[PDB]
Design a protein around this ligand. Structure first.
Ligand SMILES: O=C(c1cn(Cc2ccccc2)cn1)N1CCN(c2ccccc2Cl)CC1
Length: 175
């Protein structure tokens, strides 16, 4: 019944880079395959004079049960036809020689309480996503207001990721 094709997904109409800048706290996430930030995930977006968006993400990464590292990462975004859909060239500060490259879609946001982000790394033949990740961001790490809660839940379901998100802890672990 539900249309889960990635090309059918709506994103933030008239997305505004300047308003989106500043600190964002990831409170929930749906994982992709492979190694990935685990928790204490804080993103700091910013827009330079020329108007190109970039961001830094810090977070705990599990190497062993015995060993974690606070991985500082950096991202730089490239605009497309759609102002909510970017191409994020990203990397760890140590491994800056080595870089990854993802879709980065701002699915929805109100700029001052919540944001829903999404990325498809691989399509199935039917157009649905085979490997996706999604962050639920918040300006306040104590939670989202009632209207944000309703919207996030609605968007999570429309991305066909209902009940696939997991809550993320914030402990000042990477301060
Ligand atoms: O946890 C990961 C991650 C790490 N990897 C491994 C990796 C592959 C290729 C290069 C560096 C690291 C894959 N996904 N991500 C979550 C954070 N994301 C990111 C990075 C910088 C700014 C903003 C974001 Cl959302 C990058 C993707």
């Amino acid at each position: 019944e539900r249309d889960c094709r990635v090309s059918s997904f709506r994103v933030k109409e008239n997305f505004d880079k300047a308003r989106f800048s500043g600190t964002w706290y990831a409170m929930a996430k749906k994982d992709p395959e492979g190694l990935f930030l685990q928790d204490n995930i804080v993103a700091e977006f910013s827009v330079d004079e020329t108007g190109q968006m970039s961001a830094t993400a810090k977070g705990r990464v599990r190497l062993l049960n015995n060993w974690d590292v606070c991985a500082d990462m950096v991202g730089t975004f490239t605009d497309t036809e759609d102002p909510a859909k970017f191409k994020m060239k990203y990397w760890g500060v140590a491994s800056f020689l080595q870089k990854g490259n993802d879709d980065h879609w701002i699915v929805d946001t109100d700029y001052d309480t919540y944001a829903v982000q999404y990325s498809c790394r691989l399509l199935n033949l039917d157009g649905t996503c085979a490997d996706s990740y999604s962050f639920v961001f918040s300006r306040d790490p104590n939670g989202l207001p009632p209207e944000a809660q309703k919207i996030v839940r609605q968007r999570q379901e429309e991305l066909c990721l209902a009940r696939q998100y997991r809550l993320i802890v914030h402990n000042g672990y990477c301060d």
